[PDB]
Every structure is written in C-alpha cells, then in structure tokens.
Amino acid sequence: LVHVASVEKGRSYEDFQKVYNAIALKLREDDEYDNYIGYGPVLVRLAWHISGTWDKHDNTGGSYGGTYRFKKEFNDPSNAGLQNGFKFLEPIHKEFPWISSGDLFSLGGVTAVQEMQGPKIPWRCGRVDTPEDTTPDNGRLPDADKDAGYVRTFFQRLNMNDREVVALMGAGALGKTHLKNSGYEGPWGAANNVFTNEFYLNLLNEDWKLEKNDANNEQWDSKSGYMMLPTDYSLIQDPKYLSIVKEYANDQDKFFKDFSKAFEKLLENGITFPKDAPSPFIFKTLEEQGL
Numbered sequence: 001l002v003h004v005a006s007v008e009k010g011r012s013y014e015d016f017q018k019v020y021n022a023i024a025l026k027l028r029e030d031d032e033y034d035n036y037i038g039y040g041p042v043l044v045r046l047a048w049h050i051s052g053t054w055d056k057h058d059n060t061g062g063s064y065g066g067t068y069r070f071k072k073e074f075n076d077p078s079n080a081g082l083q084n085g086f087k088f089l090e091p092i093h094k095e096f097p098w099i100s101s102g103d104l105f106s107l108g109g110v111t112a113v114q115e116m117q118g119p120k121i122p123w124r125c126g127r128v129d130t131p132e133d134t135t136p137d138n139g140r141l142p143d144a145d146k147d148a149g150y151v152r153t154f155f156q157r158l159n160m161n162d163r164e165v166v167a168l169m170g171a172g173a174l175g176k177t178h179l180k181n182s183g184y185e186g187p188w189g190a191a192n193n194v195f196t197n198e199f200y201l202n203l204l205n206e207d208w209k210l211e212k213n214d215a216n217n218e219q220w221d222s223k224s225g226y227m228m229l230p231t232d233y234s235l236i237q238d239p240k241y242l243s244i245v246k247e248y249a250n251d252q253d254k255f256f257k258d259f260s261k262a263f264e265k266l267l268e269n270g271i272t273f274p275k276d277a278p279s280p281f282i283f284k285t286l287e288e289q290g291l
C-alpha cells in the first residue's frame with residue numbers, strides 16, 4: 001500500500017505559512033472556548049487522532065488520506081469532542097480550498113503546539129485525499145483503562161518506542177478530559193494551554209488517589225486538582241517508562257526536542273516522500289512575525 005506525497009500544485013512555503021497564520025490568528029480570536037482554554041489542545045488531539053489510525057503492518061490509516069472527513073472515521077466513538085476542532089478548521093479550508101484535508105489537519109496540530117509556546121515541529125505538505133472506502137474502522141486508538149504493557153504494545157503498531165511513547169503521551173499537558181466526552185474529568189496540570197513538561201513533574205511530585213468518577217470510571221486524583229488516566233499513571237509503574245519520565249521532568253529542552261521528533265514521525269507515518277520533494281517547513285509564529 002504505497003502513499004506517495006504530492007505537493008499541491010504550484011504552492012510553496014509562503015502558501016503554507018499563509019494557512020498557518022490564518023489558523024494562528026483564529027486561535028487567538030476564539031479564546032473563550034472550553035472555559036477560555038482555547039482550541040489549541042483540541043487541535044493537537046485531532047492531529048494525533050487522525051494519525052493514530054495508522055497500521056504499520058499494512059500501511060492503513062495515518063494522516064495521508066484525510067478520511068476523518070468521512071462519517072465513519074468522523075463518528076468513531078473515541079473521537080468524541082473532536083468535532084469542535086473539525087468545525088474550527090472548516091472556515092479555513094473554505095478560505096484555502098486548495099489545501100488537502102490531511103495537510104490541513106496535521107498543520108492544525110503543528111500550529112497549536114508552536115503557538116502555545118511548544119517546540120518547532122518541522123512539517124511536510126503533500127498529503128492527498130482518498131476515497132471514503134479508504135476510511136478506516138473504529139477501533140485503532142488506545143483505551144485509557146489499561147496498563148503499561150497495553151501502552152507499550154499498542155504503540156508498537158505505530159513504530160513508536162518507549163522513549164517516543166513517553167514523549168508523545170506528555171502532550172505538553174494540554175487541555176483536559178471531559179466526562180461528557182470520555183467518561184473522564186479534569187486536567188493534567190495548571191497551565192492547560194501552554195506547552196510544558198509539567199506532566200512529568202506532576203506525575204512524580206503529586207499525591208495521587210485512585211478514585212471513581214461520575215462516569216463510574218476509576219482515575220488518579222491529586223489534591224491540587226489534577227488527574228491522570230490509568231494509562232498515564234502506568235508510566236511511573238513501569239521501570240523503563242519511569243526512567244524517561246524522570247529524564248523529562250529534569251530536562252525541559254530534551255523533552256521539547258524529543259517530542260518534536262516523535263510528533264513529526266507520527267504525522268508522517270505511512271507517507272512516502274520523493275527525493276525531489278521539498279525539505280520540511282519550519283513556520284515562524286505570529287509572535288516571531290509581529291502579527
């Protein structure tokens with residue numbers, strides 16, 4: 001199953017920075033959403049969820065085809081809440097109809113992280129939309145009520161290793177859980193709309209109590225007001241995981257660098273990039289631009 005990247009006709013860096021900017025700008029103006037958390041975290045969750053369907057064995061799923069636009073992908077139950085991100089991006093697609101769905105959903109993710117002060121994520125255009133029959137089945141995303149062996153094993157299908165898993169899961173401690181969405185409730189840290197290494201810190205330095213929520217799901221609760229999913233918490237139960245957690249808790253920059261690599265890999269999984277394809281783009285933020 002080969003997926004060759006194909007640059008949208010005649011466009012180039014400038015073209016994509018335009019799209020970036022529009023996303024960045026609307027992220028700025030639409031700030032009240034989710035109790036003034038903003039659309040940032042939902043955008044990155046959406047970019048991870050559309051890449052997280054990839055299956056390394058058969059090269060099915062991944063961000064290449066942009067089939068989250070199909071009711072089947074779109075109404076996968078574990079995607080709940082993501083529609084808000086889809087709606088966010090819709091007017092932008094309208095304004096830049098030439099960009100492909102997959103590029104728009106992945107850049108959406110890149111834009112958020114950089115705009116929430118995370119690291120720069122290099123990015124590559126060229127994803128090409130594919131028919132609804134390519135839409136993958138509900139079920140290729142992970143469960144939250146499992147353990148480290150589950151996590152390790154799940155991610156093997158994505159070609160992610162322990163260090164990669166631990167870096168991705170961190171997710172800069174962005175946003176929170178919503179009971180109405182996942183049967184879980186609460187955030188991982190105090191700065192839910194700033195990209196940090198706070199998740200490791202909290203994980204290690206908080207006092208967690210295993211409780212049951214109003215959706216009758218267990219979760220780890222702290223006096224501070226934070227939570228952790230069982231799968232989150234398992235990162236300190238595993239001896240390999242744990243070591244990396246302490247590494248990221250003690251080194252801001254290492255974390256930022258590791259995440260940037262894994263995030264990109266996650267977004268590029270299954271895509272074949274020709275040699276005459278352009279090098280990745282590194283978009284500047286509004287801040288760097290003065291906008």
Ligand code: HEM
Nearest residue numbers: 041042045048081142143144168171175176177178181182
């Ligand atoms: C074993 C892996 C993981 C599981 C079980 C999982 C689970 C969860 C669940 C339960 C929520 C709550 C959604 C809702 O209630 O609104 C969610 C939120 C989120 N996750 Fe995942 N996820 C994991 C990994 C990832 C990864 C790899 C990233 C992305 C780099 C990530 C990014 C996010 C973010 C940013 C949100 C917050 C969205 C918002 O606040 O609206 N997730 N995750």
